[PDB]
Protein: gene rich cluster, C9 gene
Amino acid sequence: GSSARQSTPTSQALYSDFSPPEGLEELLSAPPPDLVAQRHHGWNPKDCSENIDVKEGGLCFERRPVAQSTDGVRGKRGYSRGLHAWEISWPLEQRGTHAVVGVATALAPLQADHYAALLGSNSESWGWDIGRGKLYHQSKGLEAPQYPAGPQGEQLVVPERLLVVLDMEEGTLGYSIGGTYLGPAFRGLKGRTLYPSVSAVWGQCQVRIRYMGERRVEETRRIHRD
Structure:
């Protein structure tokens, strides 16, 4: 507040730069027990929380320090071959959280954007963000004014379960629930395809993940005859 004299200057016009990591990896660099393997086996997309340990047996995210670097992270590229699909879910029963995922495209052009014609930068990222449910969109909502409900609310906020289909043999991937929204959008995705990325918040919202089709090369006899 401002009732006393001695105060604290809290003004930093810029992006973000609190306390970055610089010594923890040295703890992971060593033999990581059910933390480096159990995490990449739990819900690990790729550029996602690697410094923390997450294991199934009850979707449980585990980190040493704090979300500052261990929790609050998202996998991005993650390139794989063959047609496969995965599943993800965000349990909100806790109290307050936010599922964050989406696909990014580097080839994303910029001629007649769906809107009309604004411009272009270096790439394009489109996916499902819970920012469409924040407090920046409430008073003005055409949703059912009678009871709490909204079908179009899952267009970028599905607090329950979601099935993502990603195939490389074609290079087309999309995000749908149970395979609902991913039929007709397969004719434009062939060129709109982007890299699938997922963002997980603190371990309080621990999101669930079910993947089928991916493995882990090593030596097991796999298929050899394209």
Remarks:
- The two ends are 68 Å apart (CA to CA).
- The helical segments are 25-28, 37-41, 186-192.
- Residues 24-214 form one domain.
